[PDB]
Write a protein that binds this DNA or RNA. Sequence first.
DNA 1: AGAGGATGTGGCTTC
DNA 2: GAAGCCACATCCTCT
Lengths: 119, 118, 130
Amino acid sequence: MGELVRTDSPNFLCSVLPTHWRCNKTLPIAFKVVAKGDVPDGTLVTVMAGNDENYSAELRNATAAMKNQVARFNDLRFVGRSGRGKSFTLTITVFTNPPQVATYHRAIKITVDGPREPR
Amino acid sequence: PVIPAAALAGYTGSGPIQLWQFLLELLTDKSCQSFISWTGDGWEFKLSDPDEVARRWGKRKNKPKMNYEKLSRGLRYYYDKNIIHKTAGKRYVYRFVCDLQSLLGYTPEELHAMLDVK
Amino acid sequence: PRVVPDQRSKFENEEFFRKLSRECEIKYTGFRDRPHEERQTRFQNACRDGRSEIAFVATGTNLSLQFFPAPSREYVDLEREAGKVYLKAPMILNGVCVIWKGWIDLHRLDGMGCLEFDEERAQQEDALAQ
DNA sequence: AGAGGATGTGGCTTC
DNA sequence: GAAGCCACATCCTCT
């Protein structure tokens, strides 16, 4: 239960992510992937990220299991950085037969500091 | 000041001096052996008076509230960076695990003699 | 809705797919924080299991691959060339049945790859959706 | 005593 | 100058 957003796939939605966050820092709101069509409970869901500056960002707890059409990620974090003024392209993969993948461009910017007030 | 420890460590003046470079600077000064010194085993050292070391660290960094508790948290951050490690079981004893010989140009045996470490 | 109606057009219109059609640069995203040695074994051994993690370096688009039809032999090749490894894996990307295809140097852990519409799977899928 | 997580702060560099 | 990257400085929880 929350506020969802559409992904690049017509079969999946995901919770909202901050536009800018500090690397290795817990997210303000737990990331969730919701399936439109019927997906078997227990089905694994994973998330990856990268872009032109970082082809594959280091992530923590990027694996979750589907339960009632909802894959709730427990404390997903982004360790790798996206670069000055650059965002990550998320790749969400639902492991069915065959695997379904849903991307999400310009999902989130990750820096060492994260959001900070002027100085 | 037997040798320019801080300088040989990479400190040129750019920005604040780093904690490990600061400790090295104290370990190369005969007058500071009362509160910090080499144990005689390679680059292993011990803070015989952690409070005093913390005070100077704070003074050098302009942080009057600096105390050993916080200085040691800085040391614990060096574990993963392989700059300094803790000698398990020995109160206030740590060890430089980076390549000090290359940086300083002297081996521990030589430095211990130059500093007359008894 | 496992797929989009205009599945055929989607692959020949959207820049996302068009940019991933040519022999783009690919690379193994697995355990980048580990020694190159361990990454080599992990990558090969997992390939033998029919799975891997490759991303198109150029665009940084990551993908989790599963080399199996809708241990293999034609989906995971190891004879076509000494050192190189030709892989193949189907999937549904953004509502479009496609087939990933490329190779990787068992030493350099990188190579080239690309996507190509899957007339067969696309068809079948569209029927199930009606 | 000591390990290590969470998060803010000032120095400095690059866009 | 804003927005990055760094190396802590603070504060705490747990053994």
